[PDB]
Structure formats: structure tokens, C-alpha cells
């Protein structure tokens with residue numbers, strides 16, 4: 001009656017970590033990305049699969065789902081198959097690329113667009129979703145200059161912990177209102193503000209650019225501890241540095257104001273993803 005072609009050729013490993021591996025693969029002549037989960041990270045496969053079984057997200061700034069596959073061995077093998085973005089992660093891309101005003105805005109507005117789509121409840125639709133591990137390694141760069149948000153393995157739907165370097169103060173001081181879905185959107189907005197700082201540093205103005213650095217590179221070690229982060233973010237209330245050169249450039253001046261309004265200690269004071277979008281559409 002019909003052939004179901006399920007073979008995926010694994011061509012090259014583009015990522016290896018505690019999570020497992022990501023591979024460029026081929027299905028029927030077409031590139032796909034294949035995430036092979038470690039035993040350590042099986043719950044991330046279950047959570048993303050449960051979310052996509054609930055709502056088939058389709059958005060230009062969300063990594064495109066193709067399949068969740070569980071295969072029996074004499075162990076269980078868990079694969080997540082998605083769209084493949086050959087330019088790789090935003091983290092990767094910013095190491096070896098500076099930006100002009102148009103490319104910087106296009107990147108950050110595309111991320112805000114993806115994030116607002118996750119956050120919003122649509123009736124008749126989708127449940128509201130918080131990502132809970134937003135960071136530059138979880139954003140991919142598309143050939144058209146927009147990005148897409150990846151990895152919903154920690155996501156929570158309305159209707160474990162994130163990466164410590166990107167944790168909001170209420171996560172680090174354990175005051176987060178855990179019974180309140182809006183709390184998790186506000187944790188994402190904090191992390192978005194850090195990503196906006198990472199990108200803005202790489203935007204050239206008046207012949208000046210900053211080197212790529214991760215948030216808090218100047219105040220915490222590599223693989224900072226929970227306490228290292230708590231001391232910086234909660235006790236001392238430090239925030240990433242805004243260089244003087246930004247204040248000569250109208251775009252970077254506007255982006256500095258936006259990132260400050262993602263970093264309020266009081267989570268309810270932070271901008272919403274929809275307000276960030278609107279502000280970004282009025283810049284330049």
C-alpha cells in the first residue's frame with residue numbers, strides 16, 4: 001500500500017555535549033538536524049515530545065520540528081529531528097562575525113518574535129510556553145539573516161534548571177513564584193536581555209566593536225557555580241557593562257535602554273516580549 005522511508009543518513013557531528021550529540025543528517029536528499037539524547041538528558045526528549053504532541057508549533061523564529069523517534073535496542077535510543085541551519089548557533093556566529101545596524105536589529109527582532117510567539121496564549125491556537133534555557137547557544141542563524149529559537153527540552157506550558165550564567169535573580173535567590181506561570185516568562189526576558197547584550201557588542205559603530213564575550217565574563221569563572229552567580233546578580237546586583245561607545249550610536253543607545261528594562265531585580269517591572277518587539281520596530 002505504501003513505503004514509509006524512515007532511514008536518515010548521519011553525515012557529520014556538529015555538536016557533542018552532556019546532552020548527547022547533534023548530527024547533520026540527510027532524509028530523501030534534504031538536510032535535517034538529528035539530536036541523539038544522552039541517558040543524562042532523556043527527560044528533555046520526553047518534555048519536547050510532550051509539548052509537540054500538545055501543540056505543533058510552526059513559526060519562522062522557532063526551530064522547525066520534523067520528528068521524535070524512540071528506537072528499541074538490547075537500551076532505548078531517543079532522536080529529535082528538526083530543520084538544519086548550516087550557519088550554526090548565534091554563539092558560534094558572533095565569534096567570527098561583526099554586524100551592521102540592519103543585521104543586528106534583524107537578529108534581535110527575530111529572536112523577540114520567536115519568544116513572543118512562545119509566550120502568547122492563542123485560543124481556538126496554542127498554550128503559553130516559557131523556554132527556561134534561552135541563551136545564544138540555543139539560537140540558530142538562518143541564511144535570510146533571521147534567527148530561530150531551539151531546545152524546548154526544559155519548556156513549560158500554561159493554558160531541573162537552566163544554564164546558571166543566564167539565570168535571573170529570583171532563580172538564584174529562590175524567591176521565584178513557582179506556582180505562577182508569568183514568573184517563567186519573566187525569567188526568559190532576563191535571559192533575552194543578556195542575549196541582546198551579547199549581540200549588540202558585535203555591532204560596529206564609528207569603527208569600534210567589542211570582542212565576543214559571554215554575559216558576566218568579567219565577574220565569574222568559566223562554568224560559574226550557582227553561588228558565584230547569586231553573589232554577582234543578587235547580592236551585589238551587578239549587570240553587564242554598557243560601553244561608552246554605544247552612547248554615540250542611536251541604535252546601540254536604544255538597545256542599551258531595552259536591555260536595562262529586561263534586567264530589573266523586580267521581575268514584574270521587566271518588559272514583555274511583545275513590548276520589546278514594538279520598541280525594536282521603532283528603532284532606526
Ligand SMILES: COc1cc(-c2cncc(-c3ccc(C4CCN(C)CC4)cc3)c2C)cc(OC)c1OC
Nearest residue numbers: 002003004005006007008027032066067068069081
Ligand atoms: C514513522 O517514522 C517516520 C516516518 C516518516 C515519514 C516517511 N514517509 C511518509 C510519512 C507519512 C506521512 C503522513 C502519512 C499520512 C497520510 C494520510 N493517512 C490517512 C495518514 C498518514 C503517511 C506517511 C512519514 C511520516 C519520516 C521519518 O523521518 C523523517 C520517520 O521517522 C522519524
Ligand SMILES: COc1cc(-c2cncc(-c3ccc(C4CCN(C)CC4)cc3)c2C)cc(OC)c1OC
Nearest residue numbers: 003004005027028030031032065066067081082083
Ligand atoms: C515528517 O516530515 C516530513 C514528512 C513528509 C511527508 C511524506 N509523506 C506524506 C506526507 C503527508 C501527506 C499528506 C498528508 C495529509 C494531507 C491531507 N489529508 C489527506 C490528510 C493527510 C499529511 C502528510 C508528508 C508530510 C515530507 C517531508 O518533507 C518533504 C517531511 O519533512 C522532512
Ligand SMILES: COc1cc(-c2cncc(-c3ccc(C4CCN(C)CC4)cc3)c2C)cc(OC)c1OC
Nearest residue numbers: 014022033034035080082084085088089138150151
Ligand atoms: C541548539 O539546539 C539544537 C540545535 C540544532 C542544530 C540545527 N541546525 C544546525 C546546527 C549546527 C549546524 C552546524 C554547526 C557548525 C558546524 C561546523 N561549521 C563549519 C560551523 C557550524 C553548528 C550547529 C544545530 C546544532 C539541532 C537541534 O536538535 C535537532 C538542537 O536541539 C534542539
